[PDB]
Amino acid sequence: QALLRILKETEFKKIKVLGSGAFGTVYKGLWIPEGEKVKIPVAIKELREATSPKANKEILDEAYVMASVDNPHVCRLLGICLTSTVQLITQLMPFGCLLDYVREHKDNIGSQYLLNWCVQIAKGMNYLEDRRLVHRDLAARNVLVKTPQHVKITDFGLAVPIKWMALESILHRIYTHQSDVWSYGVTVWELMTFGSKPYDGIPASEISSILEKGERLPQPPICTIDVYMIMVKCWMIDADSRPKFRELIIEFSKMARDPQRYLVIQGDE
Ligand SMILES: O=C(Nc1nccs1)[C@@H](c1ncn2c1CCC2)N1Cc2c(cc(C#Cc3ccc(CN4CCC(CO)CC4)cc3)cc2C(F)(F)F)C1=O
């Protein structure tokens, strides 16, 4: 019945580890919902630290919000298991994170895929804005691949990635939908460089000073200047001058109609 299912351990199992971050470990698994027969492929995130009943109330309040997300380009929380180390269940995104996907499939990715991913990520971020949800950690690592044609945003349920942060976030810990636009621009740069490292080899402590001098990430080799200009707009110092997600959907959708006019990839005729 319930929007957020409160799971028993007997209902699911871990099959394969997928990755670990600072706060938890993600597994591919299987869930048979209590009272049902069907086997659902899931991702299971187990938190690194054990939590108290008090801490679990803060988790539950956020988990209900995460279960309320309903958009084709945003991952929804399906369930929670209140084990000592809490476990969080979503539908499995079988192709993993988009960062790894573009690094591992670089030779078989054309302009149409890249521009459609930019549209879809903008659509998911626009829904979050409509829901008054600030992501605060948008990056290619936090976009998942359902199919090569269908990506979804995740890991916004977490409220230091200095190299993805808007200048105002670095200087004053101000986070808004418009600082998410800055991070969107970095995410697009990641895609267009097939998962390269932003501000590579430069210490995080230097980034605010580089940005204050007007320096920005470089134009990727595949990008026409028209695409680079969208990234540049996302990195304007005045937050309210940056594009809105709705505007980014329009502009990337136009480019996706003639994708080889906007990204130049060898073999992508
Ligand atoms: O579930 C998540 N990812 C998954 N991937 C695959 C399967 S599930 C992602 C996620 N974010 C948005 N979405 C998702 C999935 C669907 C959309 N989330 C939601 C998520 C996560 C984490 C926590 C946590 C935590 C936590 C809290 C307190 C302490 C103790 N320490 C607090 C700090 C304090 C220090 O002062 C001391 C006490 C510890 C941990 C909660 C949630 C949420 F929202 F469910 F309540 C997390 O990662």
Swiss-Prot record:
ATP binds at L18, G19, S20, G21, A22, F23, G24, T25, V26, K45, T90, Q91, D155. The active site is at D137 (proton acceptor). GO terms for biological process: cell morphogenesis; cell surface receptor signaling pathway; cell-cell adhesion; cellular response to amino acid stimulus; cellular response to epidermal growth factor stimulus; cellular response to estradiol stimulus; cerebral cortex cell migration; digestive tract morphogenesis. Phosphorylated on Tyr residues in response to EGF. Dephosphorylation by PTPRJ prevents endocytosis and stabilizes the receptor at the plasma membrane. Dephosphorylated by PTPN1 and PTPN2. Monoubiquitinated and polyubiquitinated upon EGF stimulation; which does not affect tyrosine kinase activity or signaling capacity but may play a role in lysosomal targeting. Polyubiquitin linkage is mainly through 'Lys-63', but linkage through 'Lys-48', 'Lys-11' and 'Lys-29' also occurs. Deubiquitination by OTUD7B prevents degradation. Ubiquitinated by RNF115 and RNF126. Ubiquitinated by ZNRF1 or CBL at different lysines in response to EGF stimulation; leading to recruitment of the ESCRT machinery and subsequent degradation in the lysosomes. Changing L4A: Abolishes phosphorylation. It is found in: Cell membrane; Endoplasmic reticulum membrane; Golgi apparatus membrane; Nucleus membrane. Residues 12-263 form the Protein kinase domain. Changing V69M: Found in a lung cancer sample. Changing R48P: Found in a lung cancer sample. Ubiquitously expressed. Isoform 2 is also expressed in ovarian cancers. It comes from the Eukaryota. Changing E9G: Found in a lung cancer sample; constitutively activated kinase with higher levels of basal autophosphorylation; more sensitive to gefitinib than wild-type. Changing G19C: Found in a lung cancer sample. Receptor tyrosine kinase binding ligands of the EGF family and activating several signaling cascades to convert extracellular cues into appropriate cellular responses. Known ligands include EGF, TGFA/TGF-alpha, AREG, epigen/EPGN, BTC/betacellulin, epiregulin/EREG and HBEGF/heparin-binding EGF. Ligand binding triggers receptor homo- and/or heterodimerization and autophosphorylation on key cytoplasmic residues. The phosphorylated receptor recruits adapter proteins like GRB2 which in turn activates complex downstream signaling cascades. Isoform 2 may act as an antagonist of EGF action. This is Epidermal growth factor receptor. The gene is EGFR. The chain holds residues 701 to 985 of 1210 of the full protein.
